Amino acid sequence: NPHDLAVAGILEQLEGCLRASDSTGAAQLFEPDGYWRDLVLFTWNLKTLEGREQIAAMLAAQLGAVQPVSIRIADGEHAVEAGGVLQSWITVETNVARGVGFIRIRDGKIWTLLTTMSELKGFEEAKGGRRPMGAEHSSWLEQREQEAKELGYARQPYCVIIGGGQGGIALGARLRQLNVPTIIIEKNARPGDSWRKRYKSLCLHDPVWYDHMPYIPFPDNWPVFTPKDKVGDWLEMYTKVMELNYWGSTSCESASFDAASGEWTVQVLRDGQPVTLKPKQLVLATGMSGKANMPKFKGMDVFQGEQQHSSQHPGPDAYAGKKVVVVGANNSAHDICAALWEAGVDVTMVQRSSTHIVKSDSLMDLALGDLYSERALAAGMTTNKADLTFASIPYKILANFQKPVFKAIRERDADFYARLEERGFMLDFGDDDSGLFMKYLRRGSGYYIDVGASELVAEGKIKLKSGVGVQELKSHSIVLSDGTELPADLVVYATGYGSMNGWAADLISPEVANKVGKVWGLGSATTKDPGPWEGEQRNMWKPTQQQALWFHGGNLHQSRHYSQYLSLQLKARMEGLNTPVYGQQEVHHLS
Amino acid sequence: SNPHDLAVAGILEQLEGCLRASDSTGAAQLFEPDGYWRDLVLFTWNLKTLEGREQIAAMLAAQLGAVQPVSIRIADGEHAVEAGGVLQSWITVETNVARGVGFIRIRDGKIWTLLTTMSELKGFEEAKGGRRPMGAEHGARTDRSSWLEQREQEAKELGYARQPYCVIIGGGQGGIALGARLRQLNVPTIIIEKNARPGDSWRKRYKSLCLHDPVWYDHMPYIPFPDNWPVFTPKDKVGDWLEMYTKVMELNYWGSTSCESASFDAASGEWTVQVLRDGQPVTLKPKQLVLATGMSGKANMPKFKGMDVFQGEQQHSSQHPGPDAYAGKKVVVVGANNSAHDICAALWEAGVDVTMVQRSSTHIVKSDSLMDLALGDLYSERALAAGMTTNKADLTFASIPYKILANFQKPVFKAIRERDADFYARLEERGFMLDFGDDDSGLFMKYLRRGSGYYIDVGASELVAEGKIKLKSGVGVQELKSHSIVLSDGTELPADLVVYATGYGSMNGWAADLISPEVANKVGKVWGLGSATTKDPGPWEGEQRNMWKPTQQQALWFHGGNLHQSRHYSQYLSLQLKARMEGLNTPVYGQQEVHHLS
Ligand SMILES: Cc1cc2nc3c(=O)[nH]c(=O)nc-3n(C[C@H](O)[C@H](O)[C@H](O)COP(=O)(O)OP(=O)(O)OC[C@H]3O[C@@H](n4cnc5c(N)ncnc54)[C@H](O)[C@@H]3O)c2cc1C
Ligand SMILES: Cc1cc2nc3c(=O)[nH]c(=O)nc-3n(C[C@H](O)[C@H](O)[C@H](O)COP(=O)(O)OP(=O)(O)OC[C@H]3O[C@@H](n4cnc5c(N)ncnc54)[C@H](O)[C@@H]3O)c2cc1C
């Protein structure tokens, strides 16, 4: 291929500079403002180097310790040319690891480079050609019962994960494949209960092609949008067959770290019994959403009806013939209001701030179609290549990729949007018009994927009062800042959640929560994501300022992909490897 | 272009030309005089191999009116290849009611072998890929019934207020696979299984047991084992997998339910099946009954002199719980088959005095050698890397007519013998009686012909070859005395326990005990090819007797086989069941007549 020669020569110069510990020379091969996003392989971190000077500074600090380095076109792949961009899958090696990557080249200059870590040399996963035999040509069940009785009691785990939802289960499967002895702590009774507990009608709003767990993808006949209990069944059965050590009915009560011994002391209550676990690494996988935001409205003590945060709302059944006011317009607000109307309960939504609304069909086609769809698969974009393609766009410029996508969504769904506005609903498209994904990555909230509620709003079936605040709650009403008085038997506060940092404050200490800082967000200086720029998700899947404390989570996509780089970092430290973190992120917000 | 594509595509259009022309004799003229057309449902509504031009013409003359118009072409995205004078190509075939994949071999301008299969019924395709269910019903409703509610409704109504179309007896690997395929075709089906949980059929075996077939060969439909799954799966890990598979594939699986009896009423077209679901009687009235109770039938119990005199324990291999109770005892196992080898190796690991007593020869193959030389080309990592997917692997194997399979296998097992020659020499020198099939065609051919007579060695044969398991061969049982067993060479073995590892009768014995001896006789022997070899008498039948296809008893079907055959032939059985559920015209051609009652 005519492009293979072009890309391979650029890669050879890069390879030459990297072997020579020539940081400046390597950076000169990039565009002046080019990007190098590294996932563990060079930085022992999740780090995006922006521009030649940052690129050179990383290479000057890391190259001496990783030699010899190779980088070349990936086996079986070829370079392609689109829109003036030369791109190719690549393979990259250090002295202790290998990985795949992706490179984009323009006018002979590296525009973007992705390096990732796939495996640690000598600790490769027993997959494919390396499969365990299973049988020798003490039984398999006996050994499992041995591990169930000894791990966490007579013998301590290397790693403890708090939280057995989708995120901890995926991370646990990955850790199991790396022989990192691990216990998952889950206060629910069974795996999958994290999803069973939602409202009757809930389904995933992300599509199947985007949603796979590691190792066992959903089958070709699995539904596009999975009902909440069908997810539960899958997670429970995934947990069994991937041989996880999963302590259900077990609450984590407290944890602390002793830098002297390098050990945590984690106090749990397993079916009522106190147990003390002493792992070397602690992972919080308690959900990206932390502590509920409770408003401080005048007269909340005067109101004689029920007040619930959206997280304490059981559903519409108890409220036939009653009147509900939902304070909020996020997706929790839309879910709760659509259920109350389907049940024939009087519901009013009170919106103070704008919301980004996207029709499910439009999100699936225009925003996910290129990477996660039947069309994507037929074109060869496998789930792994999709994850790596998305990861290869530096967060700095992703909004630029996204803007045309969500402009097309507005033109397609314009009539839908007009009717929402004519009704008085406050629309936005992210602070910079870059859309749903960027809001999710920046603030983890502020959007609703419409599966039926927005039409109920446009048609007036869900009553809307927007543009107003709450003045006070009276004895049987809530009074809005324009003077409107809404009678209310039940007030639901759909006011969101703080960051995961609240989990650390509640389980470790507020002092440790302060060391760690706000979790999630990019530092984009937009709503609920204050600057300055950090360029990677705050405290996710990477070293934190609290030693041996980690955060895992995200949506099913991010949990699938970044559980790989988190587990490889946990494994590397279990093997006593040298892991010199570059550019460890300084804390700019205590929450 | 491809120069082989043109040759094959021209041969195929002549075939298609003749078929649209209702030219049975002319279409047959396109095969070698003795060519083969193996059909899986698509043309014959049967599993049927047409052998020779006269049979081909007769089938085509009988069926063509029922399946026209027929299209047959090279498969989309595939190309013909030529090797050793043989032209091959994947093909795609459509009828007026169905579509499917096929495979064609051509030599000197004549069709040597044709494989036609049915993949789907037109208008009843599976909800997969582009046709996935949405799962969620978007848009507001007040009559909303959630996924969990509908599932709880079906559990409560099916078999009570509403009868299933099909009932499967047996919830092992075979019934679970078939159940999955039937749920994908919206054939309401109840699995009846007397064990408590799905997967218990594997949990029930001895501690150390693993699959002796490798993972690449073993997948269940729809959810393959993952890339980190072990080659040889321990039995309890197989149990957990089936238990998860049954849950996530939405099977209606009545555990703790024994099937007591069933009878068919040709007037109503209904079965009456009496079950005990947790002790409580239920009466099920399906239109179709599938027996999936395992290929092994009634245990064969020997008639030895003095069995009534022996003062120790006597067990059939199927009644032997394991070595635990026999710490200080002396065991004699009468048999040298696979049950006997498993039981003896377990007794020897536990330090029990065990002697194996062999009368007839056994075929021994090392698990590792089966994996490389017998399965390596189709079911391996190298096969996958070469584009041979599990389904392409299944179709390639199915594309070899059974009449010629034995000669493909002979060089495979000549190679296995040369590789393991010292192993075999030490077994023969120790006095173990070896064979390699009646015509030296090896393990897979015995299995297809008689379903017995072999043991895949995972460690026990070395214990025999080295004398750790004591061997007495070439002998029968003369009599049991009060505390000993006497062999036909005069040896008197002291014995606390005698295990009779003497195999099983045919699967139709299940039909005898659950339906009636008359129905069992009408159905006849199950399994076997009619190969005129040991335990497989002629005449030649060419397909597994009564497997995955219509039987001489109306609305009675048999499902089973190894994980490979269950995976693959459950597709054709479920489609035949689905076609009848939708009231399609299904004219069976060449329905096999019974030549043996058992
Ligand atoms: C309508 C709707 C649709 C959605 N669709 C999708 C979708 O398609 N894809 C997607 O990725 N997300 C979707 N989400 C979001 C989904 O809720 C989260 O993404 C999901 O919960 C992932 O969270 P997690 O596994 O990281 O943590 P969680 O799901 O919150 O689980 C964390 C677990 O930690 C446990 N826990 C907490 N504290 C303790 C303690 N002290 N001791 C022990 N255990 C503890 C909890 O019981 C919980 O089970 C949807 C949400 C809604 C409302
Ligand atoms: C060491 C060893 C290794 C093996 N490895 C393999 C391998 O790798 N691959 C392979 O394919 N095979 C293997 N086998 C063979 C295996 O035992 C059978 O192939 C397997 O059981 C398939 O049978 P099945 O699921 O069709 O029926 P079965 O497993 O026999 O199950 C039929 C079920 O029907 C139930 N049943 C019977 N009567 C009734 C009734 N009246 N009411 C309700 N339920 C009833 C039984 O409880 C049983 O669970 C191995 C065997 C051994 C000993």
Residue numbers in the entry:
A (entry chain C): 6 to 142, 149 to 602
B (entry chain A): 5 to 602
Paste lines from the article.
In the crystal structure, JsFMO appears as a homodimer, with an extended dimerization interface of approximately 2300 Å2, consistent with results from size exclusion chromatography. Four protomers forming two dimers are present in the asymmetric unit. Each protomer appears to be divided into two domains; an N-terminal domain with a SnoaL-like fold and a C-terminal monooxygenase domain (MoD), bearing two typical Rossman folds for FAD and NAD(P)H binding. The two domains are in contact with each other and are connected by a long loop (residues 126–150), a short alpha helix (residues 151–161), and a short unstructured “spacer” (residues 162–170). Contrary to what was initially proposed, the N-terminal domain seems unlikely to be involved in the Baeyer–Villiger monooxygenase activity since it is quite distant from the active site of the MoD. While chains A, B, and C are highly similar with respect to the protein and the cofactor, chain D shows some differences. First, the isoalloxazine ring and part of the ribityl chain of the FAD appear rotated by approximately 15°; furthermore, the isoalloxazine ring appears to slide slightly forward, reducing the space between the flavin and the side-chain of His-216. Another notable difference is the movement of the NADPH-binding domain that, in chain D, seems to tilt toward the active site. No NADP+ is present in the crystal structure, so the movement of this domain must be due to its intrinsic flexibility. The active site of the enzyme is accessible only through a tunnel, with Tyr-458, Asp-217, and His-216 as catalytic residues, a combination not observed before in FMOs and BVMOs.
